[PDB]
Amino acid sequence: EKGVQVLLTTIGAFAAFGLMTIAISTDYWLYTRALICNGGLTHSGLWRICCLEGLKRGVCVKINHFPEDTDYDHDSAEYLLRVVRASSIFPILSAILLLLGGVCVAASRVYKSKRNIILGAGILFVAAGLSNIIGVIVYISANAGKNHYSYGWSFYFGGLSFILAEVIGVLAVNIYIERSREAHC
Amino acid sequence: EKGVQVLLTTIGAFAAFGLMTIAISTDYWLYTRALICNGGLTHSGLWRICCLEGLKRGVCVKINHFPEDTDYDHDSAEYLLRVVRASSIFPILSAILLLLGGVCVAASRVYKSKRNIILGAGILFVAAGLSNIIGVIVYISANAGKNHYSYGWSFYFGGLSFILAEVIGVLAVNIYIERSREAHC
Amino acid sequence: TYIVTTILEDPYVMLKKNANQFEGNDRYEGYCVELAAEIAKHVGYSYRLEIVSDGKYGARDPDTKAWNGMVGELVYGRADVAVAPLTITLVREEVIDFSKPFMSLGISIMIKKPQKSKPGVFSFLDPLAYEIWMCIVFAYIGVSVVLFLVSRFSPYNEFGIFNSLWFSLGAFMQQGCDISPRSLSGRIVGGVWWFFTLIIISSYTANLAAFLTVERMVSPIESAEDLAKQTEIAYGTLEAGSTKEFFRRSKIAVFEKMWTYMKSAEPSVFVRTTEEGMIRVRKSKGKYAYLLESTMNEYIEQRKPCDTMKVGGNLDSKGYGIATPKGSALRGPVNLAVLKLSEQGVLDKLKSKWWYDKGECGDKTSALSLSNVAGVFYILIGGLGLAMLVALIEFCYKSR
Amino acid sequence: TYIVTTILEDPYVMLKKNANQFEGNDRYEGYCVELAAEIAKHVGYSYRLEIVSDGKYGARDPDTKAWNGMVGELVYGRADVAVAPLTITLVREEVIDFSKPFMSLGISIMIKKPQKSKPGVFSFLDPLAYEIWMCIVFAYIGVSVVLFLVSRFSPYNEFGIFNSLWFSLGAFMQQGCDISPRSLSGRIVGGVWWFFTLIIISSYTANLAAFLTVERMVSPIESAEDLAKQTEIAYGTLEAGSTKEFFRRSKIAVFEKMWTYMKSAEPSVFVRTTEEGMIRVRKSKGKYAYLLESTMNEYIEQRKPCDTMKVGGNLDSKGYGIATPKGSALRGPVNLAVLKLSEQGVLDKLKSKWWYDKGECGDKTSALSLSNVAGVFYILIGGLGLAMLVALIEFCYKSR
Amino acid sequence: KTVVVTTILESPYVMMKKNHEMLEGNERYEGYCVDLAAEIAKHCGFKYKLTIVGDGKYGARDADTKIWNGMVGELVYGKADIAIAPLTITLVREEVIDFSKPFMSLGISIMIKKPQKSKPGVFSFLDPLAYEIWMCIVFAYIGVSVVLFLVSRFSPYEFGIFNSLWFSLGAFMRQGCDISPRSLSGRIVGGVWWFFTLIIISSYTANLAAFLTVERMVSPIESAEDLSKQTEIAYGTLDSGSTKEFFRRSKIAVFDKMWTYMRSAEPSVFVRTTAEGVARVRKSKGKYAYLLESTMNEYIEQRKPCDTMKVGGNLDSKGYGIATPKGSSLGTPVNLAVLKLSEQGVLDKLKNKWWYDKGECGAKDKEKTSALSLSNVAGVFYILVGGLGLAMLVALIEFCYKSR
Amino acid sequence: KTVVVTTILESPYVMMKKNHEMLEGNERYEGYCVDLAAEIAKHCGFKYKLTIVGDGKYGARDADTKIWNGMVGELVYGKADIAIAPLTITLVREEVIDFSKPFMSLGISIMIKKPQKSKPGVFSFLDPLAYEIWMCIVFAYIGVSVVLFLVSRFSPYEFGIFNSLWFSLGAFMRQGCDISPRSLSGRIVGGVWWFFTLIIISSYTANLAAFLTVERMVSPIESAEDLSKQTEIAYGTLDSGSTKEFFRRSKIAVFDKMWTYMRSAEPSVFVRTTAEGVARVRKSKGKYAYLLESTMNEYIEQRKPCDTMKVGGNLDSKGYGIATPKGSSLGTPVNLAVLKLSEQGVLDKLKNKWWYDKGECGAKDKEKTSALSLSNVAGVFYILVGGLGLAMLVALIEFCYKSR
Ligand SMILES: CCCCCC/C=C/CCCCCCCC(=O)O
Ligand SMILES: N[C@@H](CCC(=O)O)C(=O)O
Ligand SMILES: N[C@@H](CCC(=O)O)C(=O)O
Ligand SMILES: N[C@@H](CCC(=O)O)C(=O)O
Ligand SMILES: N[C@@H](CCC(=O)O)C(=O)O
């Protein structure tokens, strides 16, 4: 229950990180009709859009996250959104925090002295979760700015990533409370 | 506090009854323009409508609570409303209960043996209250079935009647709880 | 033998079960085929059923003063008789004479009005987009976990992961709160979640109000005037027919306006054949309406699936009479037949039988129906099911 | 001396401070009076200002081919000149010649659009009638007292009259519950009060939605087409004037429709005098609109209280020119003056000064403004006041 | 000889002028039919005199007597040479009197008074949700309470049947309850019930918003078939008229039933005159509806007070033609006049001005919403006072039980 | 001699036909002005030849050169006998070229692209209540908490500043709070705050319902004065045209400022052709607006894609008359033709068919509402995640403080 928890945390932490890294790298985030190739069924991703059954088949082009718009500046809402969409800093931050948590959960094993070792691991995992939610929101909002769009498997990985990221966060909290209760009394 | 309460109850019970009886008898319930006398400013009452500054001045006619309507029967919603409006059984019931409470509060003085004497007095007073509210509702609903209408002083007596009727009901409850606590222990 | 020109349009003329197997008159089975047989018996005159090459009710060329289809075949004299649903028009009466009408007619409007679309289970979720619902779920998980962490962040606070999940679910529904955050860090989480809940619930309520308002203020077309006024609806009539000519010559202001629009409508609203008109209506889902004689509207309603219905009533009195070349010898006998066969009632019975036997189909509250909110009831019953199942799991666990 | 016929209509002609004290030309002070003086100086021709008996811009009698008012006085030759805002019409040009126009004109629409009505404090209570509010108060007293009685009906229940009043007030607001009825008799009271609260709150919300929707979907008149389409608005024009004649002869379909309606409008929309038109607009509160030359619309807007404004822009180009009998000797000099005085800029400056000096008055969000919900804030601050006052009363009582 | 014209006085076909008493000759009657008669007179080159039939019923033939009355009666007797009155072209009439090609054709319509949104009933507050939803909410409420009770007693973490009923009732009204499910199995029940309550309350609020925004008033008889089935509104036709005859001879079962019933109705639903029919409708407030030709329905709607309206598709199309005695000399010229005037479109223009251009109504059609009056929400107050009554009654029952 | 007509190609006055290349003569151009020219030709009894000025700008005079170009330039040189192009009647033009009475008069209008309801912003959820209400709600919230605190500490029946702040925040969100005021003085504060919260929440819900029901889109420049003040949208006129000249010579301060600015703008807001102006508007998406005669605005709106609209009252009325060389022989016949055609109303009928009857738009005008997209409510999610962030940050601050 206590020892298995720590194993599940670590096992899950890498699985969550794995899903996020697969998601970020994969180009199957959204299936939609795109003018790119000749109203074409396209598997668009977080980073690159790959067309299917259009002008080409399997062709992958880097997406333009800054087209010719009405609101463009250094400080504009329309711009600042697209900046964050293009950068995908939130999806990435999630993975960095998941990895850094994956370090901190490992560090908690060797350094039982520091109860605050696992505390951090959890805090990171929850934050990684929050980051993911922003990441999903910024993405959906940017995609919007009726053509049918269906979220592909890559997105749902990022969805599943969050669910895990939250869960390992819960476990991390439980472990901290256990280790603190061991130090207590 | 305890003895004064009983005096306030009795004093109030007759005042509440008085307001209700004045209200029922008075013909100043509603000031409105009526076709009766020649779009005329009229002080209509619960029972009789008296015209002013029209064909006549001071003329009082018994109101027709059953005009030529679309829904008329032995059992119809439109009818059953008008029946209750015309009868004004609820305004009257209030006064009967207020009076019967006025008896029961008097009976509570001579028969201290029966704690249930005042209990009844209160129950009656609250019921008299409820009756009043139906009485106000049925009246307003029936009047409706934009010509300006303003509720005259007679109505507000019936309004003030309820407020008292409730209050004497509260006092009656307090007295019962006091007398029961005296019997208790 | 008299060659009879007749358009193939059900129920007046329908192709028999096997087009290969049936030949001559036996090829076609229709009310007009039955009526032609009755005329043939009464007048003692042999008839040959054919379909005109042009396959049009009729046309007027102003330059040439020439008719087309059934009218054209009678004008040229190539077809000896027309036993067909051809409206008796002033323009037609001058070129080819008409017998007394067998049946009354009117210009009517055919639209797919009775779509009778099922609301569908999980239509209660329609006012908020699927992504909002999914983000609400993420937000719900996010808040609970964050509330749990902040409550347990500093060692000794009654908020376990399960109690935090409950508090959050309680706050979003707004129905209840078992417990309330005491910590500043906690109260911030709750405070902001409470704000999120208020705006989303209010958003949902509002937008659901928008949906139910706009679907209560839409008026289905009730009049020809209504049809003309609406730009979004495209009423269409057969490219070549008596109705198309009537609208062109129509002296009525509302009708002249409606006719003018047809010329100035893109894509062109005129349809070559009846079936093409019917398909155009079904594909448009009422974005395009069809103008045709009330008789054919009646049959389309009777025939499954009753997709197209009638709007208002017939615009104007029309009649279909037997058409022959002006001063033909055949005209006199067919005119007398139109009276004898009508009084016989055989003609009337044939029309009654054809519509009634074919007929497959033979009541509005604005109040929300059980179907509109059905999904919520299904979820409730499903939840009660799952709850019982989980109760038995807890009961079994408690024993061991 | 040339007798000049001029209508008394501000700002062109306004009566001087003391009508008794001022006589002849000094009696009238206006832009047209100033303009007449300038014409008199330039042409070196003595002028006498009078007001025509008829007091009409002009009329056409088809039977007699006779004009009335200023036009009539020039046609008969009784009045030697017309220095007035008389529009140069084709019909007028044939009977009496016109000089080059001093100022441009257009047919405009005058309505009391800027009413700018204050919502008022205690407008938040508008969606529910006063009787409902008063009955809610009675119901609130009724429920609390009944809850108190049922709780204390049988001797030993934490519901005192004050706690019952609190519970009831808590339930109606839906914000909180200190305590909850445990007795069957109690739970019935609460149960039914809870139902009452849900329906009234929901009623209030709904009806307030209705009010704010209907006052967001009402479009103020933006075009002449809009005016013609709306039946409820009655646009009116002067009984006798160039604009009234223009609308009668107007070849434009929308204008012919608008003109036809004026004849078929009850009560009659035509008004004898400008002031009568202005008063009719103010009494109608926009149920009646006024059609007049854009110049006079401009002055009514400039003049306090700016009740009437302009809708869209001017329908059509018009001009006011000096009117003389066709081939009068006076015509030639006044035509040359209309150019000399325009180039001088004195005429233009007089028009600018008259409008600007008179002028008293010189921005829409659908969002609810503080004013709309002001009453609720006043009640809040009043409550906090009363609360503090009651707190001090409790503090003083606690000491003794 | 001057041609005597038998024209019935029915606006807008024939209207008596304001000063028709002062006026003499054909001047007294001004109408579409008067204009049409003048046009016929010009093409025929025959002087015409406007006259009104005493009865004013265009056709009346007793089956026993077999003698026509009204316009038909004046042609049969030969006293009137010509009829510009809009006589319906019927088979029975066609055999007795020669008929010109119809100047106008119109269907048999239904005239009913406009529906009233007045007098919102008690329990009008329950209108936004259908009765089956309300009944299912009650079933759902019982279902949830019982399931919450069972799970709580079978798998304890208390929730008695009465406490579970209270919790559920508390949750539906969005009122907080101090008791809360603690068990996972319990919290699922509560959780899903809470979801059900939020959507229904929100649905109710929304739909009630829809109703109060947009007023749609239900037509009492939407169609003729509906009218016959319900029998809620009595249906009447001109006591002596083509409409009364057509219904009698009608081969349709629903029409035969309607004819039998109208013939077998006391008091008589049959009316002497059009005007009598219109007044009967207004006095009945929709207890009586009127069957008349769509043309007169159209102008009756256009004329104030804009209350009587045309409902449903026309029962059948009927033409109106210039009527002459059988084999009349006038017949041929008038038939050619009708054809000439139809090609000219003069008839259509005359109809347009009289029928719609008059604009007595102006075809008037999101009026400022009214604050809810105590009537609209009266039911909820009645339920409240009833509940308080029942509560007190149950309190006294508990008090009496506690003593013994 | 055949009269050379200098007509600019601007629809609907002049449109090149589908097969105008195949066609020869005047057949290539079909327009209102072509129809009008034909009418003038018939009254004058003079053969006319349709021609287009090379420049296509009706007036161009350099102030230094003082030489006219376009239609004016063809009349000055005498190469074109007559101009059916709609030349504006201006004082400067009137002195150089003889002008017939205006066939049509139209005002100087503003053409802008239609406003877009797309891209709901973050904090769009706060739109139904004005910013001052939100700020006053915050003040009210602080007011209530502080007053509840003071009354609780001064007249005790606990409510600390932090607990009072929590109670108030709890009450505004309609979320139940375990702590409740017990004192009369306290319960008044809570009681009235509860009333405030119920009305505001209900107000917000209602008004948000209004917004989502009824879409009204704000015009970027509602009036010309507004446009000049904001400077948000650049305003442009025909580089060489009556509109550019009128603004320069305009004695109005706002107009002089607008003229100076347009003249002093880089890149040039002045456009070579009408079509160039229309395209510039569409590419700018309302960053650039167009000033042109209301007539061309009208037909540009009627032509697809129905995006460019007419905003505000016309800046001033301008007439368009048949233009001839100073003292031309053609001048008199054409002036009489304009007067004859105006009385006939032929001109008005021609304008009606071309301007509105074409119905390319059909003047299209409660479309089915769209489910709220995450964008519309995005702000509330951002606030939520921001709050959770801040909460965690404050939790760690409390954790660090607890250690030391
Ligand atoms: C204790 C804090 C309460 C704050 C009260 C806020 C409201 C005050 C009354 C506003 C009246 C409406 C007009 C005000 C004009 C304005 O500020 O725009
Ligand atoms: N059925 C009509 C044609 C109807 C139409 O044009 O759609 C005829 O007989 O000519
Ligand atoms: N001012 C106009 C009259 C306007 C009107 O008829 O209202 C004129 O000079 O005749
Ligand atoms: N005009 C009809 C009477 C009116 C009617 O019943 O419609 C007839 O000749 O019988
Ligand atoms: N027709 C104008 C040019 C177009 C305009 O600027 O409106 C002229 O003659 O100058």
Residue numbers in the entry:
A (entry chain J), B (entry chain I): 16 to 53, 79 to 185, 196 to 235
C (entry chain A), D (entry chain C): 390 to 545, 565 to 770, 778 to 815
E (entry chain B), F (entry chain D): 393 to 549, 570 to 777, 781 to 819
What is the paper's account of this structure, in its own sentences?
AMPA-type glutamate receptors (AMPARs) mediate rapid signal transmission at excitatory synapses in the brain. Glutamate binding to the LBD triggers clamshell closure, which transmits to the transmembrane domain (TMD) to open the channel’s gate, or leads to desensitization through rupture of one or both LBD dimers. TARPs are principal AMPAR auxiliary subunits, comprised of three groups; Type-1a (γ2, γ3) and Type-1b TARPs (γ4, γ8) are widely expressed, generally slowing gating kinetics, increasing agonist potency and reducing channel rectification by polyamines. Here, electron cryo-microscopy structures of the GluA1/2 TARP-γ8 complex, in both open and desensitized states (at 3.5 Å), reveal state-selective engagement of the LBDs by the large TARP-γ8 loop (‘β1’), elucidating how this TARP stabilizes specific gating states.
Cryo-EM data processing indicated that not only open states (L-Glu+CTZ bound) but also desensitized receptors (L-Glu only) were present on the same EM grid, enabling a direct comparison of both states after classification and refinement procedures. Desensitization, on the other hand, involves D1 interface rupture, which relieves LBD tension on the linkers to close the gate. In the desensitized state, D1 interface rupture separates the LBD dimer by 28 Å between GluA1 Ala737 and GluA2 Ser741, but is mostly unchanged between resting and open state (17.7 vs 17.4 Å). The open-to-desensitized transition is accompanied by a large rotation of the GluA1 LBDs while GluA2 undergoes smaller, more local rearrangements (average residue movements of 24.5 ± 0.7° for GluA1 versus 14.7 ± 0.6° for GluA2). This is due to the GluA1 D1 lobe driving most of the D1 interface rupture upon desensitization in addition to closure of the D2 interface, leading to a rotation of the whole GluA1 LBDs. In the desensitized state, a predominant ‘elongated’ β1 conformation facilitates robust interaction with the GluA2 D1 lobe, proximal to Lys410. Indeed, 3D refinement of the ‘GluA2 D1/β1 particles’ generated a desensitized receptor conformation. We hypothesize that the γ8 β1-D1 contact stabilizes the desensitized state, by slowing recovery out of this conformation. The conduction path of the desensitized receptor closely mirrors the resting state with the gate shut. Densities also locate to the constrictions of the gate but these are only apparent in desensitized and closed state structures, implying that these binding sites disappear upon gate opening.
